[model samples]
Structure formats: C-alpha cells, structure tokens
Target: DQVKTFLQKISHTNYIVRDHRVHQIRVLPGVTLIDMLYRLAAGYLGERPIELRQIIFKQPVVTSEEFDKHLYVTFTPARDSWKVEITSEKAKNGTPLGGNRDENMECQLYLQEDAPRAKELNIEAFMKNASRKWDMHDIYGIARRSHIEHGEFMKNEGAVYQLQDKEELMELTLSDLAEGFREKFKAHPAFLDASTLAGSSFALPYIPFMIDRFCMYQPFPKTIYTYSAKNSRTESGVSDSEPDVYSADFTIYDRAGNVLAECEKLTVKRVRQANMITHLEHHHHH
Candidate 1:
C-alpha cells in the first residue's frame, strides 16, 4: 500500500457538550480534526495553498478523560490530489478497545499553487441592517432553551447577529479556550467550531456533517465574522420523526472585513436524541 499513515493521541475533555441532560459527551469537533488534516497536508505540500472538497464527517469521535483515543489518518494518492480517511480506537489501562476501526471523517485534498482571495465585506452595512440584536448572555441563553448547551471552552460570548432581507451577518469573538489555542492551528479549531453553531438561532440544532467546499484564504484573527444564508434548496422543513437536513453557505472573515475562509453548501443534520450517555459510560467500564 502506497498510503501514508499518521497517528496521534486524544484525551481532551473540553469538547464536551451537555445538552438536554442527555447528550453529555466529549465529541471531537469536526473543525479540530480538519485542522489537523490541514496541517498534515500543508506540510506535505511545502505549505502551498490548499483546498478540501467533498469533506464528509461520518461519525463524531466520542472521547473521554478516563481513556486515551488513538487517532489514525491515512492519505492515498488520487488523480491530482489525495484521498484521506481518519479513524480512531479507544484504550483503557493500556488495553485496546474491541475494534480497530471507527471511521471519523474523509475528504479529498487538493494542493493549489495559487488560490483566489475573497472581496472585502461591507461590515458597516452588515451591522446596520440588524433586524434583531442580543447580548452574549442572551445568545447562549437562547441556545440552552433550545436544547443546545456548550461548555465554557466552546462558548462564544459577545456574538451578534444581523438579519436583514436575505443577509445574515454574525460578529463573534474567540472564546477563552479558542483564543488559547489560536497559535497551534492554521485555522483555529475552536473558532471554527463556534462558527458552526450559527445554525442554533434558526432553531436548527445541527452539527457538521458534509461540506461540499471548504477553502481558506488566509489566517484568521481573534475576532471573526460570518455571513451565512440558507440554500433553501435542501431544506426538508423540520419534523420530529426524522432528522432535519439543511444546507447553507458561510463566508468567514476577519475584523478588517477581509474574507478568511469560504464554506459552500455546508450541510448539517439535526441531532434528535442522544441517549448514549449512559451506554457509553457503561461500555467504558467494561
């Protein structure tokens, strides 16, 4: 096999989300994993501009402090790019878990000689067109009331949303933990993680599942901005019986109103129930 394999350890508990008193699991953020992939691919390509397409997250790596998570990434050569897959296995007391296969994410990585920059955003008009506004406490409050709870590390306080006639703009600052980890990644994992929560205001308690296109222009700042609008084509009209599916376009920018990253047709699915809290705990003990 002419494939390159990379392995790392994961035992962080900061990604835990306690929602509805049922969903209390330390899920490795998809952005964080993608950040790792970005670092790996960028290094292999001599730090050239890169773009990941058809990025799909198959499963959330449920991690814990009680055990260690061994993450494995494999890269295979494609036509002009590489096909990558990430998997992980758990271990406790130096003993491995039953299986050696738990696929987390996969994507097609393209190394670019040059990538285009996005146009500057009219930030003044974006804030001025606010149809509604709320403070940091209120935003998190609204999220919790809707069955979405984020830990302190993932909390994005002082974030504002401006909704005006098809334009949805959000201005956000890095959380404590996000700011702390800013220097480690090309794209701050926690910062991008906070950006994914923008769907909460739409009553869509969703998670990152499939992103048709993810391209980064430059490094992001401590304060980030986002402009997102519903695709409207993939809207399933929410229901209780089935998971809600929605697609949207996200334009990530910095304080200078310069575009940092662009995510096109980022598809997310609602989490109806998380009844594995007890089951996972029991499984870990045995």
Candidate 2:
C-alpha cells in the first residue's frame, strides 16, 4: 500500500503486477530488494509533508528475540525477463540478521529501462546539498538531534572523553563495516536498566544507554570480550591497520544479483568486554 504507492510515485514507475509488486524486463543495478525496503523508511512522503510514522516491515518475515524479521532477496534471470524473488524463510540455520522465525515472500523484478529516476538520490552532490529524513537508527531525527545538542553542550562545557567531537558520539553506535572496533561494538547491543534514564544525574558515561532510549530503532552493541591472540593480536581482530572484510548471503536484484554492498552486511570485528570505553572515573562529567 503506502510503500508501493510511494515508490511508484517517487520513482514514477509502476509495478508489473505479479502477486502485487515486480519489475518489468530488467531492474536497476545496485538496488537490492531489501535495500529498497530499508530506503522505504527514508521518509516516503506523498504530496504532503514529511513525517516518520509507525511503519511495518514490508517483508513480514518471522522475528526472534535477537531480531524481528527474516527477509532475503535473490535474483534468477529468465530468458525473457529477470526473476527477482524476495523470500521470507523460517528460522533453521539462520544467523542473527539472516534468520530467526519468519514469513514467506515472493516478488520479482525485471529491468527498469525507463524507470523514473530521482536525480537527488543518484547524484553525490545531493548528499552534501540535502538531508536524509527517513532513517532507522536516527528515527524521528531523535538521535541526530540529541547527538547534535549533546555535542554543543560538550563543546560549551569542554568534553575530554575519548569521543571529543559532536559527531563522534553519534557515530560510535552506528554499525560500521570498515572499522573492526565499531563492527563488533554494534553486535550484542547495549542493554541498560530503566533506572539509567530516570534522573538527570544518571551515569553520564552511559550515553549509549541514553541514546538508545531516544532512538528506538538504534543498534546497541553488547559488552563482550575477545581472546589473547598470537603475535599480540586483539581478540576482535582489531589492530593499528585496516580491518577485515566479512561476507554474507545477501543478494541484490540488479545484473543477476551482487554479493551485498560493503556496508549493508552490518558486520565488523569482535571486541573485549572488559575494554569498553565506559567512563568510570566520574559519571557526573556532564
């Protein structure tokens, strides 16, 4: 409904109509079916104003305690047209992000030869020139605004925490693909007691706990640890150099599907639980 209408209206392309939604002869390159769903939350407004609403997962895949859904898309090309299928599988050998218990899905994508294009989305300049409205981590722009305001406070009050910049705190929680530390940090989301946010004089180093309360869709990393490795290696595989590359079964719909985009995997190296950057010296720094 809203997703289909908004996508068609924004891209000016109509679905080919299989069970409801499918591309024509060929789909656009680089855009995965799941990616499309992710972007759907990116403030898909009609002719009215932009408002982030309580949206349901389009795939309807089953969810588990660790996750909420199991949605995966794959493309199989037929001679006449490309077969882009988005399936919702059950929880058998599923990973945290891949599976748990879910519904079944079936949708195809051909090619979007004449698919309407949003110049703003495709152009790099658009990023610098504009702002993203639809986001899960920063849902309702809650975390974004909180981060910016906190940064201003830190600057005015003089912050010396390891994260000195305003944006630093905001990004610490993002699931990073390039950095081993951030990658591992994203897994095992931070879980805090409700009392942490009850009063103004709460544990300040527990900023992540606060941010999570603000951004309901935020990803909080668990406080886990790594092993003492050989050659002075860190358990999470982090070092003073580049991080490792992780792969997943995620597939795209364009050009016979590609192995997930670099950032989409939401994977990174592991971390030591004891070494988390929690401010133990003074919880009243702010």
Best candidate according to TM-score: 1
Instruction: Tell me how far the alpha carbon of residue 162 in candidate 1 is from the true structure, in angstroms, after superposition.
Output: 2.1
TM-score of 1: 0.84
User: Cα lDDT of model 1 overall?
Assistant: 0.68
lDDT (C-alpha, whole model) for all candidates: 0.68, 0.21
- The TM-score of candidate 2 is 0.22
In model 1, the Cα lDDT at residue 207 comes to: 61
Model 1, 1-286: lDDT tens digits are 2489887566644342221122454566776777888878765666778888899997566666576677888989897888989988886655667666678899998875555545678777777767766565565674466455566666666656646445556677766666777777788775677666554455424567898878888887777887776433256665444557777778887767888898877787766444444544453442
Candidate 2 lDDT over residue span 92-130, tens digit each: 233333423222223333222232211111122322333
Candidate 1: C-alpha RMSD to true structure equals 3.6
After TM-score superposition, the amount by which residue 196's alpha carbon in candidate 1 deviates from its true location, in angstroms, is: 1.3
Error of 1 at 178 (Å): 3.0
Flag regions of model 2 displaced more than 4 Å: 1-57, 65-80, 92-107, 111-286
- Relative to the true structure, candidate 2 has a C-alpha RMSD (angstroms) of 22.1
